[PDB]
Amino acid sequence: RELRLLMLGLDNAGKTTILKKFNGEDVDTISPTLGFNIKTLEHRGFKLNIWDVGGQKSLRSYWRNYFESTDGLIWVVDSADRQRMQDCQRELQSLLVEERLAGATLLIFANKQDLPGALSCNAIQEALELDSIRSHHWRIQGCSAVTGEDLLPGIDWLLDDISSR
Amino acid sequence: SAKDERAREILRGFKLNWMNLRDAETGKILWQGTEDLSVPGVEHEARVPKKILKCKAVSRELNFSSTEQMEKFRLEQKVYFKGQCLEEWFFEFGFVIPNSTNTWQSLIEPASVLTGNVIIETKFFDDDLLVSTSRVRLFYV
Numbered sequence: 001r002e003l004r005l006l007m008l009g010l011d012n013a014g015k016t017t018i019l020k021k022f023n024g025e026d027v028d029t030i031s032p033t034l035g036f037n038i039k040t041l042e043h044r045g046f047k048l049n050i051w052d053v054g055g056q057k058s059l060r061s062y063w064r065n066y067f068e069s070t071d072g073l074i075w076v077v078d079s080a081d082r083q084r085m086q087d088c089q090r091e092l093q094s095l096l097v098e099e100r101l102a103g104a105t106l107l108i109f110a111n112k113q114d115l116p117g118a119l120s121c122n123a124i125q126e127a128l129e130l131d132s133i134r135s136h137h138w139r140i141q142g143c144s145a146v147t148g149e150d151l152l153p154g155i156d157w158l159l160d161d162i163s164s165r
Numbered sequence: 166s167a168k169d170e171r172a173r174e175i176l177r178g179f180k181l182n183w184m185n186l187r188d189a190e191t192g193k194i195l196w197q198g199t200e201d202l203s204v205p206g207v208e209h210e211a212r213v214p215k216k217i218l219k220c221k222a223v224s225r226e227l228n229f230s231s232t233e234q235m236e237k238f239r240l241e242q243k244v245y246f247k248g249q250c251l252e253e254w255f256f257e258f259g260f261v262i263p264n265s266t267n268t269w270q271s272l273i274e275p276a277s278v279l280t281g282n283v284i285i286e287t288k289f290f291d292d293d294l295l296v297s298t299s300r301v302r303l304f305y306v
């Protein structure tokens with residue numbers, strides 16, 4: 001069975017840079033996603049459909065039109081954006097009561113770790129109240145879309161988790 | 166009828182901006198298409214480097230705009246050599262946001278013959294209404 005992955009977060013989080021770097025494509029000319037960027041490929045024998053959806057205020061309200069039949073959700077965070085960290089928390093918890101996302105596996109990318117003022121995973125773990133999450137399986141992973149650091153470790157786990165259920 | 170008019174602003178507002186071809190192993194573009202792929206009276210064409218016939222990794226990307234919202238968007242792609250079929254792809258996007266620009270990529274895994282005889286036809290549907298039809302002729306090198 002093909003797997004459907006759904007990638008969300010606040011605008012400027014790193015979603016599109018992560019999706020591109022992960023496919024071995026350049027990331028030097030990325031611009032705000034004004035819709036959705038879908039990528040169909042094969043990884044470790046899995047047939048995937050990865051949906052990266054724009055995170056600007058205007059686009060966000062359409063997020064739920066893509067909830068259906070989602071196997072894993074990737075929530076992407078700008079580790080160095082302490083300013084919207086609570087709006088990030090709100091959006092996520094709100095995603096955790098969605099009925100069309102129930103039993104989906106949650107993966108959290110603490111992105112932009114290559115940045116000077118980046119909060120650890122613990123800080124981000126704490127900031128988003130992940131410990132209180134029992135509705136889904138989850139896992140946080142810090143990384144860097146630009147350097148390509150620790151992207152596979154997250155996707156590989158996500159892929160194995162969904163497959164086990 | 167209001168349905169006709171609606172089914173008319175949906176057509177008017179949709180535009181296929183570009184298509185491209187990459188070597189999936191490297192992530193390098195082999196060919197990106199300018200080029201009023203939507204315009205009529207023109208047989209759209211791709212002058213691709215022959216190496217493309219050597220990779221096992223080819224990825225094709227599309228980029229499209231829609232002024233209008235649509236609830237059951239889907240596409241059908243077929244690559245033909247004459248009457249023979251090389252590849253047939255399908256994809257259900259479902260919902261399409263109003264005033265939005267979207268991308269779709271799939272990873273596809275001798276010459277004097279192929280050049281000028283390879284066609285890629287992408288058909289775009291909202292539910293079952295045809296919204297757009299593209300055709301691109303392949304010229305190897």
Ligand SMILES: Nc1nc2c(ncn2[C@@H]2O[C@H](COP(=O)(O)OP(=O)(O)OP(=O)(O)O)[C@@H](O)[C@H]2O)c(=O)[nH]1
Binds near residue numbers: 032034054144
């Ligand atoms: N230093 C650093 N900058 C990053 C990293 N990832 C993305 N960026 C920068 O963050 C910016 C926004 O990156 P995008 O990939 O467009 O973000 P996005 O989540 O797709 O944004 P939307 O399309 O608005 O949803 C860019 O200026 C990238 O250069 C990262 O790991 N480190």
Ligand SMILES: [Mg+2]
Binds near residue numbers: 017053
């Ligand atoms: Mg983006």
